Amino acid sequence: MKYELIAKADFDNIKGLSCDQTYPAILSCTACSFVHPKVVILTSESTIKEPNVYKCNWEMKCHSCKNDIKVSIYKSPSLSTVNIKDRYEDDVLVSYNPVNKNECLLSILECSGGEIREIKNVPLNILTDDLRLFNEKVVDEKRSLAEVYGNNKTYSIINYELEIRRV
Amino acid sequence: PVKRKNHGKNRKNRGSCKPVQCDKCGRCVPKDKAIKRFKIVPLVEAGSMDDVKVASIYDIFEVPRISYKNQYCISCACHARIVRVRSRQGRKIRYDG
């Protein structure tokens, strides 16, 4: 059961999106149709390793049926890098995920015990089409963030909605 | 030293026997040096014995049973605890049916 992270909205004057590999989610067992009532935060830094049976990124044991649930996080396949200049005249290498036509991939999830239902919102990093970078933006209640640059430049997001689809 | 009187199996005054095959692993074993069990199970469960009575179109009928014979090599047999290690003086007891 291989899922993905895909953001779809109306985009203008952006070049890419970036985030931290951390997502709160609601999980559910596949032996019993039971929804875990509490949200669970998952990180790409927590490692659990056994030598010859399995390896995983997060671990869980069910309460109703005691079935094992293993979650693992992978990185994005289409990950590219562009140079950028700072305020002072120098060069710095940054990494980002390129926005395609009305779509953008972030990360790959995978699961061998249970399902994923809903993922919460992450404060993503926005890349400017005309070669600039801003650190941390949080999408508001309207699901639409707009910000104006000083020299009469504007970028915006319209109707930001997250989705998951198994492959 | 010698461990058992008959060495591995109960074969006397013969030269050879054709081999049979285990069900779990599938290695060849001679038919004398095998472990064979017999058990008879019914088609219906005892937990579902009363519930067929309300659904029967017939008045009275018999529930049928089937038999089975199994064969194993001795590596598979001791692993599934069909046959266990016994005492040295208690090895000579033979439980015929």
């Binding site: 596949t30 399902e115 | 692993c25 290695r27 067929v52 179109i57």
Partner: protein, 131 residues
């Protein structure tokens, strides 16, 4: 009296450790009334042959078979057969209890596991399957 609204049908069940398949047909065996397998309702590959997914696979059978006018059902149970170990799976007793529970009467139960007179060479070497 045998109307088009009520008749007698035969049910085949093929249960192994990996999967259970429920196939119900008429008295001849040439036309399929309904056929729903246990793997079609489950989502994880480990749970195709579980007794949990079989009772889901038996209850949706009783819903569609009520539309096509079946009153009583005969039963044919079998295993894997051949060179495969032929023993009855876990989902055998689960399926026969759930169709009866919905209100359908049973006619006859028979055991049809095909047993060979002689075997062919099984999988595995002279020393066997060693895990």
């Amino acid at each position: 009296i045998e109307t088009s609204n009520e008749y007698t049908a035969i049910c085949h069940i093929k249960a192994t450790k990996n999967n259970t398949i429920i196939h119900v047909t008429d008295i001849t065996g040439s036309e399929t009334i309904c056929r729903i397998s246990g793997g079609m309702r489950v989502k994880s590959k480990r749970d195709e042959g579980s007794p949990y997914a079989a009772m889901i696979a038996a209850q949706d059978v009783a819903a569609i078979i009520a539309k096509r006018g079946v009153k009583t059902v005969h039963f044919m149970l079998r295993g894997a057969g051949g060179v495969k170990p032929k023993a009855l799976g876990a989902g055998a007793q689960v399926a026969v209890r759930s169709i009866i529970r919905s209100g359908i009467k049973m006619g006859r139960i028979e055991d049809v596991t095909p047993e060979p007179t002689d075997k062919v060479r099984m999988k595995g070497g002279h020393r066997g399957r060693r895990v």
